[PDB]
Design a protein around this ligand. Sequence first.
Ligand SMILES: OC(O)[C@H]1NC[C@H](O)[C@@H]1O
Ligand SMILES: OC(O)[C@H]1NC[C@H](O)[C@@H]1O
Ligand SMILES: [Mg+2]
Ligand SMILES: [Mg+2]
Ligand SMILES: [Mg+2]
Ligand SMILES: [Mg+2]
Ligand code: NA
Ligand code: NA
Ligand code: NA
Ligand code: NA
Lengths: 206, 1016, 204
Amino acid sequence: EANIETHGMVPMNRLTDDPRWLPAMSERVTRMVQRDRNHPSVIIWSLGNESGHGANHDALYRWIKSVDPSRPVQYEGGGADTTATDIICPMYARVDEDQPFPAVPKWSIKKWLSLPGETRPLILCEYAHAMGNSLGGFAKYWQAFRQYPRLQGGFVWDWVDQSLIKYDENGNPWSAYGGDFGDTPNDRQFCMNGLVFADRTPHPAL
Amino acid sequence: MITDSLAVVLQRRDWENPGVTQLNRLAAHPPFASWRNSEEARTDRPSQQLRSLNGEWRFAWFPAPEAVPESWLECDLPEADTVVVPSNWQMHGYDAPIYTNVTYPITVNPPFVPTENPTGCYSLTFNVDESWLQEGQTRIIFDGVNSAFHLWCNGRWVGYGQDSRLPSEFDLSAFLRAGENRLAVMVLRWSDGSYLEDQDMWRMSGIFRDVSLLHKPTTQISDFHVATRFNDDFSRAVLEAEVQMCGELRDYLRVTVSLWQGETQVASGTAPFGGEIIDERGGYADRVTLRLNVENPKLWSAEIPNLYRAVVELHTADGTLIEAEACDVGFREVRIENGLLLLNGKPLLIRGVNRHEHHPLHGQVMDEQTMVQDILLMKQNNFNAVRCSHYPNHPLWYTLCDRYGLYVVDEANIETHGMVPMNRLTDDPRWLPAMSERVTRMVQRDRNHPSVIIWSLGNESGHGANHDALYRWIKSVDPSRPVQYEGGGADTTATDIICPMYARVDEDQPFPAVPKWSIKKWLSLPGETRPLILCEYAHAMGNSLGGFAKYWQAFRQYPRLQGGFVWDWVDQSLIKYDENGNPWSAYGGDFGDTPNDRQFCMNGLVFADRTPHPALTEAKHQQQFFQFRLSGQTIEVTSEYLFRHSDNELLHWMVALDGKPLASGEVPLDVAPQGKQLIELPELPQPESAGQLWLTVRVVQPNATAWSEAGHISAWQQWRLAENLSVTLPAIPHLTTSEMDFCIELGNKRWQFNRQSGFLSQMWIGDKKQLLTPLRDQFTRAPLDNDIGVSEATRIDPNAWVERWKAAGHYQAEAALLQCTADTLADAVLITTAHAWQHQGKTLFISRKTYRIDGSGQMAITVDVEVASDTPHPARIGLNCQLAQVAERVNWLGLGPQENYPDRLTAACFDRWDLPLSDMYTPYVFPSENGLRCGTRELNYGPHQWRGDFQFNISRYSQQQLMETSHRHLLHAEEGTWLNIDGFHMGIGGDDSWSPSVSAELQLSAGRYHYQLVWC
Amino acid sequence: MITDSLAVVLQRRDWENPGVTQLNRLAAHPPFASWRNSEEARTDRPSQQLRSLNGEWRFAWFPAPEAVPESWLECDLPEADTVVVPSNWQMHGYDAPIYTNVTYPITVNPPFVPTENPTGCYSLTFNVDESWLQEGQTRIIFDGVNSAFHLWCNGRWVGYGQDSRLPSEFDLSAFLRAGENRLAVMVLRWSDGSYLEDQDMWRM
Ligand SMILES: OC(O)[C@H]1NC[C@H](O)[C@@H]1O
Ligand SMILES: OC(O)[C@H]1NC[C@H](O)[C@@H]1O
Ligand SMILES: [Mg+2]
Ligand SMILES: [Mg+2]
Ligand SMILES: [Mg+2]
Ligand SMILES: [Mg+2]
Ligand code: NA
Ligand code: NA
Ligand code: NA
Ligand code: NA
């Protein structure tokens, strides 16, 4: 995945729809493909994450398709099914329940496959948000993946808690999140979404 | 002040770095004027917030940027001179312009350029009023700088700009001050942008477009887009205007967009800022989109260029105007549907031409007067479309195309033709940021112009992945216009239109990875569904456009063949001056510029002073919007207009009997778009005199338009009617036999036949000799540019016709007299001759002749010519002599007033024509065979008359002098009149000019040839 | 030596300009080792032409790049510390890591970043063998620098690079010399590339 996320912009595609930022975005995509295109484990290129959908995405999608046709390109931003992705790749679309947000709805993944004119496979780039005591309803996803041929799985969010170690005054280490370093504004425990702790000990969800 | 110095600024070497195409340049946008009055914006009166800095600047030339002294940043150099800006400094004599086609003018080593890099230092002292500095933003706009430049303002470094064909704008608000200011602009001839600017044209440099100051308020309109959407019959339109602001968002802020037709306000909309939700984060709080309904909008097209005026007012909620901008709106929809390019639902037929921005005195500086002259001449010769080969033009060009009606292909300033391979940069992602700015800044500038119907990605840069990326960018940002791009084989994934250059109609050219199929064949290749429009065809280099009618037959027959763009509009000649002051047209290496490609810059339908070449009338006839068929007494007129009724059209018809008018009439045209009108001619008068009856029709426009005078002829056609062959029947000439000559006496007259040469050597009328050179067979012509077959001066085509004629010895062939006898009939004298032309013991041609001199003074000449099948087919089969007469007029019954060739004669008409003798010589800048008129049954020059069925030219320049002279101003008139009378003349070709292009049926390949002539 | 100074190099403010994402960076490519033996390349034994400069570097932290003294381009700062590279300096205590999800860690005003822009000055004295300079090309490879950096080699400015997750490579062949060399790398925490790096993670 290219090193491009402009999530804090308002709207999200404010830079990715601007041709002044097309040269900077183009280097994040093209230098990734030039570096990693011989690795067999890389099967899909991603244009980045949470940067809306802009014309720069469509351009860099087509660049990758011209330079390396051996790998699909995916990109979730701007509604998970834009012209910049070969795969319907939503984040946290539910199995049976629609979430009808105004310009970027998250249809239920069963419903999304049969929308008129939709033919791509669907692979969730993020699903089953493993924040703390979580992964409830995980079996519903895997029932749906096994039943529906174009539901070809997804990527759990995510592998490892992003906790950092701090030390108490007696020397004992402890796992720190968010604003435990005086950092502010922070988002507290939202960095810990892992199936495993930061020392790679498994959570029960694993 | 260390960082502003030339030692610091020049040390990064930003002109040798494709990752730096600009520093501190503002965003691109549509054309702004910053009106502070909405009425002034509506009427497009000149805004006092947009200041023009064109005029006198100080200029110094240096051989490299390192030679520029540091003091130039603060004060004007004493050695600097006063020059007009905009200009190209090569036109002022500071260094030479370079004409190179493919080969780059510098050493190929990207991104580096030569250390000898010619540097123009421009400066301007100028006053800024203090009301511009107390509030608002003052920006400077350079509409065009070639090729790269650094900018200082009051000694402080401002920024750096690239791309010599789009505007570079810089914020000067922190740099200006009250009182005297000073710009210092250091313009470099070569930069890394020069690798993307390898167009086949003169390589010049300087500040060659307008320079302007624009004052905007701090809260400002920063961009606006106008879209038009339609229903299926175009009876309801929605104008969608998206307006973006920069500056402080206040809740009182409003935008009103009003639509005006002439004086009536048709649609208005008022809205605060705030777009609809775009994604999870929201929408643009600094944009607002207004939708205006227009019921039955007058649609825009090249036939009827209906324009509305959109005014975009930024104003507060209590109604105080902050700033207005505006643009002309043309309501039209451009779409490709089911393989056809539609305009307003109708399939276009593109009558196009490529047009460089070229002026022979000002070089590459365009002015409104030349733009208007080009547009008028284009529309008067039935063009409806122009390709901006190969860069964004001056901003006024699109306005004039909006208002006069031309479809425009707007093309990015990207050509990397000299690279090996051609896509070496365009397939490199390091050059993707530089190419992306040439495309995206063109679309941001020109996307509101209705005349622009197609975007082009550039020209002759192979096909790389950067093309595919920028294709898809344009399709995402502006879906209202197709994208085309020829490079890499004309049918890649980077083009919506099959757009080949010089693909032939019927003949494939199967090059290894980029074949040029015949355009009929290309459409039906498996999996091919796009329309085909040639981005270049019919290469008009010199005496050319042979075979032009074959293209237009194919365009009319095949629906997905939707036309093309002729190469090209105007000769790229420049004016030089001889030592006595006389100007002359110069090409290629006439400025000491090497390597150069000589006369290949002159490919125009018109001369550089916009006088038409003879090919332009062939273009006008084939592109005419009315087509004609003659059943028997009925003329069927077909309209090829898509949108307008023939409401300014009058058919004139005339029947003549070999020039003499017998009947004529007038019929108003009343034909719908794409419809037919039947016109029944009256009872024509079946004459008694022998000869061929001819019917000629011409469509005249009785009313002037914005682009043509009253009485303008827009279309014509001629037919043969009934013919009546003559069966009527007509002293005795005395034959002197000497050992050296045969002399035939009749009355005052004498004919002399050299018995050793075998040719008629002299003629006597009264006491005066009539010939300066004997009447002799001629099989060669002074070679056209199509005969010479070169597009790069370093590479010779051994299959070129002039190479084959020279290697066969056609120009060197010596006549061997075989037979020459004389017999006295009982009513005439008959001279019989036979000659063999040989080169190194090979007989190329045999000519057998009989001269019959009767008692009525006529000389009947019969010629039978045999050509060896293994020699290359000769350019002509005819006779040539130097007449002793120099008469003023040429009078003759045959095809057309203008020069016409067997390959290029459809625009000519059979009639009696009478022109001055200078009109029978076409002054092509590179001299060649010229001035031929085909289909001639009678020719009169002074007291002489030739009859038969021949082609001729007549002039004061022999074919030898035309072949040996490189420039038309070096021609000198020879003492008599050179007469070339051809039984047979080869076509001129012109599908391209760098390969053999004469079609096989226009070549003199029959082997045996007969023609008869009567001289009286 | 005027053009190599911090007063000149920092004046363009290349980390506040999306039109400058690098200066003098070499082209990207697949992973190279430059084996001079085909058998070693086949078995992927460690190439002696690929030298690792990980280990102890000298490091100084500054609250902005303007606070970096000009003498750091020539000699190691006396107040600089010895830190392991690769590392994130927030893990060594020099400033705090920031966890922000969506909200950018700086004021949203692209392409500008705060004037308080934490600056890590890294330097390394290292020997180059003389057989590397007599022939061939010696390039330096930074596999990851967060978020932007200027590079000097023996006091001469080499180049600039952004994108904290791909390698930045620079030709050092004209800058090195036999005997002791010295890199000086000025790493900026925030740049215009930070607007493209708003992932939900710790900002280091
Ligand atoms: O694409 C055009 O610029 C080129 N094609 C042939 C023409 O003479 C010119 O060199
Ligand atoms: O796309 C990912 O980086 C984001 N989606 C939710 C997750 O917690 C993270 O913030
Ligand atoms: Mg440059
Ligand atoms: Mg070319
Ligand atoms: Mg930058
Ligand atoms: Mg995010
Ligand atoms: Na499945
Ligand atoms: Na998270
Ligand atoms: Na057609
Ligand atoms: Na040319």
